[PDB]
């Protein structure tokens, strides 16, 4: 996040779930979220991510 | 036995290109005035102006056991002429267009495809045909059939 000016916080990095731990304050109140965004993967040639 | 063969052509490449051209441009350009003014003794009004469509129709016919070019050479040396008749299907709208059905009947033309040509007069040869397309439709059923000889 920015040095001091971030009004929110976002943290993910789970095992396989597209869930974040968005919370105000400094994670005094960890309110979990399930992210809308679907689950997409690019295709081929130019791209590869597998 | 004997069948026809149609591949669309890019009109700047009448002879040197025999491969498959795709239908891309839908704008007819005005590069005909300089050739239409070359006439002297023909019943053509100089007041009006004309303008060609893009793309050409290529026609040649194949029968097994021989080569397509020799078949086409035989065909023209006999008097083969491909009659083409195109019928147009109106688009699904009737508010901003009509349902009018129109057809054009044309005869093809003979074209000596440009190359080295070690022979003198008869050479690689393929029939060519104009390609019109009107405003207000997409569906064009083309019909190719023999002249009769």
């Amino acid at each position: 996040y920015t040095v001091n000016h971030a009004p929110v916080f976002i943290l993910g990095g789970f095992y396989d779930e597209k869930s974040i731990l968005f919370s105000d304050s400094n994670f005094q109140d960890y309110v979990l979220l399930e992210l809308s965004i679907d689950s997409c993967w690019v295709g081929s040639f130019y791209c590869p991510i597998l | 036995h004997c069948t026809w063969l149609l591949v669309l052509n890019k009109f700047e490449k009448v002879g040197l290109h025999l491969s498959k051209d795709r239908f891309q441009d839908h704008e007819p350009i005005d590069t005909v005035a300089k050739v239409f003014q070359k006439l002297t003794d023909s019943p053509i009004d100089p007041s009006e102006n004309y303008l060609s469509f893009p793309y050409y129709l290529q026609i040649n016919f194949s029968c097994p056991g021989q080569n397509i070019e020799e078949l086409a050479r035989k065909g023209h040396l006999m008097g083969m002429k491909p009659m083409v008749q195109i019928n147009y299907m109106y688009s699904v709208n009737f508010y901003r267009w009509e349902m009018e059905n129109v057809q054009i009947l044309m005869e093809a033309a003979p074209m000596r495809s440009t190359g080295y040509c070690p022979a003198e007069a008869m050479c690689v040869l393929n029939w060519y045909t104009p390609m019109p397309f009107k405003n207000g439709s997409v569906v064009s059923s083309v019909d190719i059939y023999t002249n009769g000889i």
């Binding site: - | 097994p64 699904v92 709208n93």
Partner: protein, 298 residues
């Protein structure tokens, strides 16, 4: 709004507009989506209104197996499976908001040993083989409806329906394509097609057959390059009353796709299973086998 489970076609072209149907599972089970495009200007909506379709029929939930649209008279015909596995064909009007149950598609498929066409009366016996629909079809020139699946049904009105004895219940329908001139092609999951003419009632088998084998060998010694011993029926369809099929070939040096004609007139003209009669002529016996056509020429 998502969770779309199926796309469904609208073949017709009316009101200067094209139509598609979106069926959705997971959520909004009692609801469907109608998508109308007016000359490239696209819109979609959720037609079954505030009430779920489960309000006006027994059961609890509703599953939309298949739906179809009729631009004339602003109609929707769709078949709903209910929680007890029963399939009910219900019609719906968009101009005025009704849905009405129009058929209660009976199960436990009946028998017809010789009743080649069977009006589906009530006093009909039933066999242990069940019924399983996978969709319907509308032929809107004569204003008629087809029901496919493990069986075929048809009608002109919407009161009764006709069952055809020839088509078995051991083969399930892949799909059905149309001439819009009177010719029905019905493809099965067995990769076999059945040809039916609207004037008659009998459904004529085509591709595993005497006529097809004769045609195939005839092409083989015709030595063409459109027929191969190994083939894959990638697709098939209709155009100006002629059946085309897109077929791929794994032939060595000829691993190629092409479209070819399937002339069914010749195909069932080469059907040698037929009556034969032996007469005596000039103190010799000749197979002067009988003529089944009612006439000579038209």
């Amino acid at each position: 709004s998502e969770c779309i489970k199926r796309l469904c076609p609208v073949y017709a072209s009316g009101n200067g507009s094209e139509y598609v149907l979106a069926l959705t599972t997971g959520k909004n089970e009692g609801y469907i989506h109608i998508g109308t495009i007016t000359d490239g200007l696209v819109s979609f909506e959720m037609v079954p209104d505030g009430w779920s379709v489960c309000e006006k029929l027994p059961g609890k939930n509703c599953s939309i197996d298949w739906a179809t649209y009729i631009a004339d008279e602003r109609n929707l015909l769709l078949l709903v499976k209910i929680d007890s596995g029963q399939f009910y064909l219900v019609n719906f009007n968009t101009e005025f908001k009704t849905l009405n149950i129009l058929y209660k598609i009976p199960e436990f498929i009946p028998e017809a040993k010789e009743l080649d066409f069977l009006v589906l009366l009530d006093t009909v016996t039933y066999t242990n083989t069940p019924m399983t629909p996978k969709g319907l079809f509308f032929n809107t020139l004569n204003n008629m409806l087809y029901i496919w699946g493990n069986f075929i049904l048809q009608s002109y009105n919407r009161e009764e329906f006709i069952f055809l004895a020839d088509f078995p219940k051991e083969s399930t329908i892949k799909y059905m394509v149309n001439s819009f001139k009177g010719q029905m092609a019905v493809v099965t999951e067995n990769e076999e097609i059945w040809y039916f003419l609207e004037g008659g009632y009998d459904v004529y088998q085509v591709v595993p057959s005497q006529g097809w084998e004769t045609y195939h060998n005839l092409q083989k010694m015709q030595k063409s390059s459109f027929h191969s011993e190994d083939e894959s029926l990638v697709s098939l369809f209709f155009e100006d009353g002629k059946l085309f099929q897109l077929v791929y070939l794994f032939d060595v040096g000829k691993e190629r796709l092409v479209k070819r004609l399937l002339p069914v007139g010749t195909l069932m003209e080469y059907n040698l299973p037929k009556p034969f009669t032996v007469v005596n002529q000039g103190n010799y016996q000749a197979i002067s086998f009988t003529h089944t056509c009612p006439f000579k020429e038209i």
